[PDB]
Symmetry: C4
Subunit: 114 residues, 4 copies
Amino acid sequence: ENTSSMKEMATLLTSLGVIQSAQEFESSRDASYVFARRALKSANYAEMTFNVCGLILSAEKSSARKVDENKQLLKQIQESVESFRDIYKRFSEYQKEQNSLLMSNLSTLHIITD
Amino acid sequence: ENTSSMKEMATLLTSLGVIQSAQEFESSRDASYVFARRALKSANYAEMTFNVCGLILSAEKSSARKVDENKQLLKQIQESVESFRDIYKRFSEYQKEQNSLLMSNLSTLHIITD
Amino acid sequence: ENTSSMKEMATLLTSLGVIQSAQEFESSRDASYVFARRALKSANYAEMTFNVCGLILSAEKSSARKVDENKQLLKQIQESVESFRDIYKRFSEYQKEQNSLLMSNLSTLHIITD
Amino acid sequence: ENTSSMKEMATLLTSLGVIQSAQEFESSRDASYVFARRALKSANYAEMTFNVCGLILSAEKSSARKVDENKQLLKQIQESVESFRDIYKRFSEYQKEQNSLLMSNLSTLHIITD
Ligand code: EMC
Ligand code: EMC
Ligand code: EMC
Ligand code: EMC
Ligand SMILES: [Ca+2]
């Protein structure tokens, strides 16, 4: 409906450091930005409110995806540390075993206790 | 009040990749989406503003829950690494002990210093 | 201005699982909820818009604090793993040393190479 | 347009603990707060809606950056644990080797099996 405000928004978001370049604001296929553009090019309160509703849901969903990416990384770290501990447990147990086998092998060299 | 816009929103959210299927938008028991639907089917600014308020609080709460899930995972990883370190400490100390017991057992084979 | 909608919101947020009990909605000193209540008890668009602005900034800030809590936990885990690695490095090096001291002590028992 | 509400907001955000000091609200170069101030000093619904749109996008972007900071920390922890495991694997293998070399060196002291 009107590219004036869309233009001013792109410039302002860039100057504020929210986006790296204006072309990025407009154009972008990002749900949040799509709804924002549609909101700026709205001329009636039914389109505007519709588009703001869409902007809020898009924002919520994109943030949720990023938090879920972190959750997956945490799950990988958790299982990795768990696997590590159990490899360490198996090894330590083996080592304690080797130690006693070694001390016993060394008992066959004693002059006393036989 | 009006399923037209609700219908257009479901389609748009799907096409934008915000949701995987439209039926998911409508129907869903998600607080954010419940308020969004109620907001679209509003015909007066008192219901609309009421529903937008609810949408923002629902969004904040759902994001907070996801961030809290990550926090719990971090606490589990932290205690797990701590437990691991202390198992390693106990083991290393035991090993250093076994070493000296071994070197001493080997001193009973020296021809000198006795 | 009007406790009717505040009442309906508390009930709805509870039924939707956003909050655990209605008394919690009203009353709560949470910035987001304070502004939400003020927004519901608004009767003019100047108070309403003022209160919605406050609600969005409060939401952003509370989410930022929770994400920062996770960041602190991550920093503690990172330094903990780093400390652990270096304790392991020091120990392994010590062990490799003990090994060669042991093999050499065992060379004083050879019948050949002397 | 009007510093009255901007003034009341700064005071309220401070009293609610959202910000630590009022001067911080006004002044701040934070995109979210810039748009909030512009929203309060709006006198027409075209500027207001413009500024609220900007506030929501700024909020989304700042939260996304913080979540991305956590993501980077998680990647560093993941690779760190992976590197650690593999140093442990290499060492354990070396140790098991030293053990058998030791047991064999000890077989040259047997009175039987030769
Ligand atoms: C008026 C925002 Hg759906
Ligand atoms: C006008 C959004 Hg409570
Ligand atoms: C009209 C929300 Hg500051
Ligand atoms: C009316 C918020 Hg862009
Ligand atoms: Ca996180």
